[PDB]
Amino acid sequence: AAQTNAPWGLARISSTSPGTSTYYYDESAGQGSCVYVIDTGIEASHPEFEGRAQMVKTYYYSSRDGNGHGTHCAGTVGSRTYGVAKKTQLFGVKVLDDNGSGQYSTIIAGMDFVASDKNNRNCPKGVVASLSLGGGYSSSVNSAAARLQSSGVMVAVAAGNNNADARNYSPASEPSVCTVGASDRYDRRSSFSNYGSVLDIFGPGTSILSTWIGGSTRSISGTSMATPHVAGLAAYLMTLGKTTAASACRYIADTANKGDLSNIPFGTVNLLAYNNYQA
């Protein structure tokens, strides 16, 4: 399939070169996969989700996304227009309050929740978790992410937006999960993107157009925004049978566009997520 005039990120993930606008993807589009978006929630009522989004868990008075970020990232994963995996099931876990903040314990609980909750869900093609959040290093945050991964969830996490080595951030620094840097549409490391040896992959992260609360759309920037591209990609790949949750990060890195990004520090992988779809 070909989505014309797609957000540049989507186009980029299905391209060997930057500067194209069409997203190409196998129509299966992640059908039969599930992606948990562990974030501020998801406005499931957004027509862009087509009833494939729902909130499964909140740690706050409401499960509504009163921030937008989770909605935005869910959109990148799987909205019909702005999403990588346009037929995936999105599950919202609101670990972040409407200011975008959450205690690590909540976040940890959220991650453990997903690890269990997937057993309540129909996800024959596999399960992904998209964590577009980040704080300073925490071994317990890392270990939660590692449990989640170990449970058989493909965990994609944001490297962080500190223009620093992601070793000092969590869950970014957890080696077993997929730590995602951000690139811009000219194939530059995003100026805010964290880097370092813990990075597994880059995705589109600067100026990412996706769904927003109030039934709207907006463009924002962050490794937070790259993460869902990789999560969506994993869900897409898993649906195609190309990989599994345990190996998805490695598979994406193996099949990434190599050496295409500029301003990647020495020691950091030069790998841009790529669907390898051949139309």
Assign 3-class secondary structure to 81-101.
Answer: CCCCCCCCEEEEEECCCCCCC
Enumerate the H helices of the chain as residue ranges: 8-13, 69-78, 104-117, 139-150, 223-239, 248-255
124 known member of a binding site: no
**Helix, strand, or coil here: 106?**
helix
**69-78 helix and 223-239 helix, angle to the nearest 10 degrees:** 30
184 known member of a binding site: no
Please report, for residues 19, 150, 217, the alpha-carbon distance to residue 108 in angstroms, rounded to integers and kept in the order given. 39, 14, 29
Helices (H) and strands (E) in the chain, counts: 6, 15
175 known member of a binding site: yes
Domains in the chain, ordered, with CATH? 1-279 (3.40.50.200)
Which amino acid appears at position 207 of this protein?
Answer: S
177 known member of a binding site: yes
Closest to 23 (Cα-Cα) out of 43, 45, 4, 46: 4
Q: Which residue has the tokens 């740690």?
A: 59
From CA 213, how far away is CA 66, in angstroms rounded? 7
Phi-psi region of 154 (alpha: psi -120 to 50; beta: other; left: phi over 0): beta
**Helix, strand, or coil here: 105?**
helix
From CA 111, how far away is CA 177, in angstroms rounded? 12
The tokens for 48 are: 């862009």
How many CA atoms, within 13 angstroms, populate the side-chain half-sphere of residue 81?
14
Resolution, rounded to a tenth of an Å?
Answer: 1.7
Closest to 76 (Cα-Cα) out of 64, 66, 88: 88
Contacts of 64 (CB under 8 A, 6+ apart): 41, 43, 55
**Helix, strand, or coil here: 172?**
coil
From CA 14, how far away is CA 20, in angstroms rounded? 10
Q: Which residue has the tokens 């406005």?
A: 43
Contacts of 172 (CB under 8 A, 6+ apart): 134, 157, 158, 159, 160, 166, 179, 194, 198
Which technique was the structure solved with, according to the deposited record? electron diffraction
Please report, for residues 78, 108, 158, 234, 278, the alpha-carbon distance to residue 30 in angstroms, rounded to integers and kept in the order given. 8, 26, 21, 9, 16
Contacts of 193 (CB under 8 A, 6+ apart): 159, 161, 163, 181, 182, 183, 202, 205, 223, 226
From CA 163, how far away is CA 201, in angstroms rounded? 15
* Catalytically active residues, by annotation: 39, 69, 224
18 known member of a binding site: no
